[PDB]
Amino acid sequence: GMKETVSNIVTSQAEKGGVKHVYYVACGGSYAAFYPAKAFLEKEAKALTVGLYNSGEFINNPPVALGENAVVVVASHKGNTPETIKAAEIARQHGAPVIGLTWIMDSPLVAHCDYVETYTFGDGKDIAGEKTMKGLLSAVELLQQTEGYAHYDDFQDGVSKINRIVWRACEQVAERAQAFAQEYKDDKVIYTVASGAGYGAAYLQSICIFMAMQWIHSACIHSGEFFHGPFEITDANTPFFFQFSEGNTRAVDERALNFLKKYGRRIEVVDAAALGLSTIKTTVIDYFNHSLFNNVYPVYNRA
Amino acid sequence: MKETVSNIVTSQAEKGGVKHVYYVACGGSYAAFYPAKAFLEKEAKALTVGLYNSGEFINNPPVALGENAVVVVASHKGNTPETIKAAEIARQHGAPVIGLTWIMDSPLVAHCDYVETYTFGDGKDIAGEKTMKGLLSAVELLQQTEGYAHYDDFQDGVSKINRIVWRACEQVAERAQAFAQEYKDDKVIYTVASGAGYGAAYLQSICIFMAMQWIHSACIHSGENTPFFFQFSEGNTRAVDERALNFLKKYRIEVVDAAALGLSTIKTTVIDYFNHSLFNNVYPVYNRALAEARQHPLTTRRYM
């Protein structure tokens, strides 16, 4: 578990000052899966600090506050990214506790870590156990067991529903994942746009799907930064793969989409209100956008 | 920043001290605060820092927005609607605000418990620039709370940057020409970066390639036939840059090198926080040589 893991950690570091800092440390889509955790602690924490880090930048540039007073979550997959793993071993050298996420126990990750959780990974897998949700629970537990977290139950309601919603949204989306793939097939360049705690999924959809699995060109525009430069490349030929969030930055998302609809032309909207996410409670819904989009988008990407 | 940060350590040590630092701005200025943020992340054990787009901060502010948190806005002309509502909100949760601007009568300034400016314009001073002020807010809050071990070494970095840059501007000028002639056909150019440089490559992306030229770009992070404007940084991520450049080289690439441009005169301990000031001030050399090879006044907006 992550609860017990945080408990052992709280207890162990208790005598040194306890846990004051959380670092998420991974590569690309592992770096990106941890964006919700970062957004969570930045919004919710009153005393914890957070940092999300690329495992290459982490290994070559560790923060000084990498202590026994910090905790360090790292993900890989196979568990073999001499960078994720340089990281988990520079941490222990610093005596920071270290959670590991991986799919593959045998890996030299799981022999370099102070603990190790797994995650679900596979077709028709349980999402409540996915890499992203173990990132997020690691954050909610760190908060809950240190300062307390006012909406803990809600989060766990949220988490109870993110298999129904996702898989029952994944298949609602040949609705359009046909048309989409037809329309954009030949475009050399496609933008993603996104904000809030779900932003990381957009980022993943550029670097990992389009711009490396489709040899395509893409970038991720912050739906709020978009009005301070990006804005200007809006043609009627420019394709935007738009991620419309549920939660506190849906207003930000909306102002972007108004513009793009009344000035742009070719915008593939993927709307989480539309996919039945408001089943999750407003107090916490922000943190589930990523798990939705990240699990739907492969339907478009396959097509 | 030293006086401004000292008034603050004073004002607030009463109400609990300074725990949280929040840099909030839109676009270019957002990008200018990036080294700052990376300084704290790297350097601090007590203090917290967030870097937020004004639009997101106003719609979803942190609950730690309070008397123990300092909010640092920024606005060149000094009147972005978002950034101002952020400086409003912060005041109305007891947070000391600090405006960074070029226009000291701007409607932002009616909303800023202190204000500072920087050098700007043609042929400015790089020890005075918006980013170096943003960056010294960071080094002063860290020093005047929990201490900065390499504070002296930083003050020496400040000593040399102005002139490293005026050399590197005139160093890149012949090369800009060539660049300009290759890339003026291209409708897509990536920038590449890592470290407390990453703010520069991002602005290069969104603020000049996109806004000014209508060129499609992304800022791709090292860690994470095609052109690449490639920022080979110095310092602690030089290795991560190196290993990216290998891919490109081994497998249409304008490498701009912080070490070839003469950075290393700054000490290893602080060199990381000076890539942005360089890259930011070398770039316009490339950009005008680009604008005129295209037929596109950097002045060209078609909206705001």
Q: How far is A296 from chain B (nearest CA, A)?
A: 22
Using CA atoms, how far apart are residues A61 and B39, in angstroms rounded to an integer? 11
A228 is in an annotated binding site: yes
Complete DSSP assignment for chain B: -HHHHHHHHHHHHTTT---EEEEEE-THHHHHTHHHHHHHHHH-SS-EEEEEEHHHHHHS--TT-STTEEEEE-BSSS--HHHHHHHHHHHTTTPPEEEEBS-TTSTTSSS-SEEE----STT--TTSSHHHHHHHHHHHHHHHHH--TTHHHHHHHHHHHHHHHHHHHHHSHHHHHHHHHHHTT-SB-EEEE-GGGHHHHHHIIIIIIITTT--B--EEETT----EEEEE--GGGHHHHHHHHHHHHH--EEEEETTTTTGGGS-TTTGGGGHHHHHHHHHHHHHHHHHTTTT--TT--S--
H or E segment at A6? Answer: helix A3-13
Question: Which CATH architecture group holds B2-146?
Answer: 3-Layer(aba) Sandwich (3.40)
Give the 3-state secondary structure of B220-261.
EECCCCCCEEEEECCHHHHHHHHHHHHHHHHCCEEEEECCCC
Resolution (A): 1.9
- For helices A174-184 and A289-302, angle between their N-to-C axes, nearest 10 degrees: 60
Which pair of tokens denotes residue A244?
A: 């419309």
Q: Which residues of B are annotated as a binding site for Mg(2+)?
A: 224
Cα A267 to chain centroid distance, Å, stands at 23
| Chain A residues touching residue B188 (CB < 8 angstroms) | 188-189, 217
For residue A41, give the 3-state DSSP assignment: helix
Q: Are B302 and A232 within 8 A, CB to CB? A: yes
For chain B, how long is the longest CA-to-CA vector?
60
* A-chain residue closest to B300, CA distance: A232
Which of A233, A237, A262 is most worth mutating to test chain B (most B CB atoms within 10 A of its CB)? A233
| Chain B residues touching residue A236 (CB < 8 angstroms) | none
From first CA to last CA, the distance across chain B in angstroms is 32
Select A164-302's CATH number: 1.20.120.1760, 3.40.50.12570, 3.10.560.10, 3.40.228.10: 3.40.50.12570
What backbone phi and psi angles, to 5 degrees, belong to B178?
Answer: -60, -65
Q: Which residue carries 């701009």 as its tokens?
A: B256
Residue from the list B56, B206, B223 with its beta carbon closest to the beta carbon of A229 = B206
Using CA atoms, how far apart are residues B274 and B233, in angstroms rounded to an integer? 10
Q: Are B59 and A251 within 8 A, CB to CB? A: yes
Q: Are A28 and B224 within 8 A, CB to CB? A: yes
Q: Are A252 and B55 within 8 A, CB to CB? A: yes
Using CA atoms, how far apart are residues B93 and B98, in angstroms rounded to an integer? 14
Report in angstroms the alpha-carbon separations of B183 from A246, A302, B71, B255. Answer: 40, 33, 40, 13
Q: Which residue carries 């005008």 as its tokens?
A: B288
Rg (alpha carbons) of chain A, rounded to whole number: 19
H or E segment at A47? Answer: none
| CB within 8 Å of B289: residues ≥ 6 apart | B176, B177, B179, B180
| Chain B residues touching residue A222 (CB < 8 angstroms) | 53, 56
Phi and psi based region of residue A143 (left: phi greater than 0; alpha: psi -120 to 50; beta: remaining):
alpha
Which of A60, A69, A147 is most worth mutating to test chain B (most B CB atoms within 10 A of its CB)? A60
| Chain A residues touching residue B224 (CB < 8 angstroms) | 27-28, 31, 54, 207
Domain B160-291 has CATH 3.30.465.10: no
Rg (alpha carbons) of chain B, rounded to whole number: 19
* B-chain residue closest to A212, CA distance: B224
| CB within 8 Å of A219: residues ≥ 6 apart | A191, A192, A206, A211, B205, B216, B217, B218, B219
Using CA atoms, how far apart are residues A115 and A93, in angstroms rounded to an integer? 15
Contact assessment for residue B279 and residue B197, using Cβ atoms and an 8 Å cutoff: yes
* B-chain residue closest to A150, CA distance: B63
Using CA atoms, how far apart are residues A264 and A258, in angstroms rounded to an integer? 9
Q: Are A225 and B26 within 8 A, CB to CB? A: yes
What backbone phi and psi angles, to 5 degrees, belong to A130?
Answer: -70, 170
Residue type, B243: R
Q: Are A211 and B218 within 8 A, CB to CB? A: yes
Pairing of strands B20-25, B228-232: unpaired
Q: Are A206 and B195 within 8 A, CB to CB? A: no
- For helices B151-171 and B173-183, angle between their N-to-C axes, nearest 10 degrees: 70
Common-topology check for domains B2-146 and B160-291? yes
Cα A51 to chain centroid distance, Å, stands at 13
Select A3-150's CATH number: 3.40.50.300, 3.40.50.720, 3.40.50.10490, 3.30.360.10: 3.40.50.10490
A230 is in an annotated binding site: yes
| Chain A residues touching residue B207 (CB < 8 angstroms) | 228-229
Q: Are B211 and A222 within 8 A, CB to CB? A: no
Contact assessment for residue A275 and residue A293, using Cβ atoms and an 8 Å cutoff: no
Q: Are B214 and A230 within 8 A, CB to CB? A: no
Pairing of strands A240-244, B253-257: unpaired
For B176, counting Cβ atoms within 10 Å of its Cβ (0-12 exposed, 13-18 middle, 19+ buried), the class is buried
Q: Are B224 and A31 within 8 A, CB to CB? A: yes
Using CA atoms, how far apart are residues B259 and A280, in angstroms rounded to an integer? 51
| Chain B residues touching residue A221 (CB < 8 angstroms) | 206
Residue from the list B44, B221, B301 with its beta carbon closest to the beta carbon of A232 = B301
Which pair of tokens denotes residue B76?
A: 């060149």
A4 is in an annotated binding site: no
Residue from the list B26, B44, B236 with its beta carbon closest to the beta carbon of A61 = B236
Using CA atoms, how far apart are residues B199 and B93, in angstroms rounded to an integer? 29
For residue A84, give the 3-state DSSP assignment: helix
Q: How far is A287 from chain B (nearest CA, A)?
A: 13
Which of A228, A246, A250 is most worth mutating to test chain B (most B CB atoms within 10 A of its CB)? A228
Cα B63 to chain centroid distance, Å, stands at 26
Which pair of tokens denotes residue B256?
A: 């701009």
Q: Are B43 and A64 within 8 A, CB to CB? A: yes
| CB within 8 Å of A197: residues ≥ 6 apart | A35, A36, A39, A40, A43, A247, A286, A287, A289, A290
The full set of domain ranges for chain A reads: 3-150, 164-302
Residue from the list A63, A69, A247 with its beta carbon closest to the beta carbon of B41 = A63
Complete DSSP assignment for A244-299: E--STTHHHHHHHHHHHHTT---EEEEETTTTT-TTS-HHHHGGGHHHHHHHHHHH
For residue A236, give the 3-state DSSP assignment: coil
Q: Are B62 and A42 within 8 A, CB to CB? A: yes
Residue from the list B219, B302, B304 with its beta carbon closest to the beta carbon of A227 = B304
For B109, counting Cβ atoms within 10 Å of its Cβ (0-12 exposed, 13-18 middle, 19+ buried), the class is middle
- For helices A289-302 and A131-144, angle between their N-to-C axes, nearest 10 degrees: 170
Using CA atoms, how far apart are residues B112 and B86, in angstroms rounded to an integer? 11
